[PDB]
Amino acid sequence: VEELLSKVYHLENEVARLKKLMATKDDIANMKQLEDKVEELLSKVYHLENEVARLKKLVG
Amino acid sequence: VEELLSKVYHLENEVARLKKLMATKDDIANMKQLEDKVEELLSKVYHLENEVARLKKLVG
Amino acid sequence: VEELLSKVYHLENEVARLKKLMATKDDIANMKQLEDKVEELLSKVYHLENEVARLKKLV
């Protein structure tokens, strides 16, 4: 019982500490939209590069 | 005591597991930094697309 | 013994709540990939801005 009382006090402290620093699902709720925007940027930059390359040849 | 011993044992395993699997507030800070970079990029790319369109018209 | 079982009961409830609300390392596993792509995008957009400025001047 002396052991079990100390262990519970340890767990209490451990739970409050990890609760303080744990990321929640709410915190990362935006992740899919962030990924989408990176994907959008990859495409738009690719197409911009192609257009700029064509323009660089036309201007000469 | 027989219950406590069993319950505390499982609780310790669960808490250890949570600590290992969890993402943290530091990861959230990093996500927010990335969001800020992406937002800047979206703005820059929009402006670039507008300039390129103007140049395409004027070169033609 | 009874008060310990009470505190353990509350703790089990707290842990179950945390387990359901937890975001995990596997969940954000794509974060480093996005970070790498974004660093490359920053570089590419820098170069695009430079080339567009040069073309604007020329035109």
Residue numbers in the entry:
A (entry chain A), B (entry chain B): 8 to 67
C (entry chain C): 8 to 66
In the authors' words:
The structure of coiled coils is understood at a level unrivaled by any other fold. They consist of at least two α-helices, wound into superhelical bundles and held together by a mostly hydrophobic core. The seven positions in a heptad are labeled a – g, where positions a and d are oriented towards the core of the bundle and are thus mostly hydrophobic. We find that they indeed break the α-helices to form short β-strands, which associate into a triangular supersecondary structure we name the β-layer. β-Layers are found, also repetitively, in natural coiled coils, where they form regular fibers with alternating α- and β-structure, a protein fold that has not been described so far.
From Thermosinus Tcar0761 we derived the constructs T9, with the full MATKDDIAN motif, and T6, with the shortened motif MATKDD. Surprisingly, the alternative T9 structure, T96, starts out in the same way, forming the β-layer with the first three residues of the insert, MAT, after a g/c position. Consequently, the middle three residues constitute positions e, f and g. It thereby shows the same 6-residue element as the structure T6. The last three residues of the insert are accommodated as a sharply localized stammer, before the C-terminal adaptor starts in position a (highlighted in pink in Figure 3A and D). Thus, the two structures T6 and T96 show that 6-residue elements are accommodated as N-terminally shortened 9-residue elements. We therefore thought that the central aspartate of the T9 insert might have been sufficiently unfavorable (T99) that an alternative, with the alanine of MAT at the center of the β-layer (T96), became observable, even though T99 allows the flanking coiled-coil segments to remain unperturbed and T96 requires their distortion.
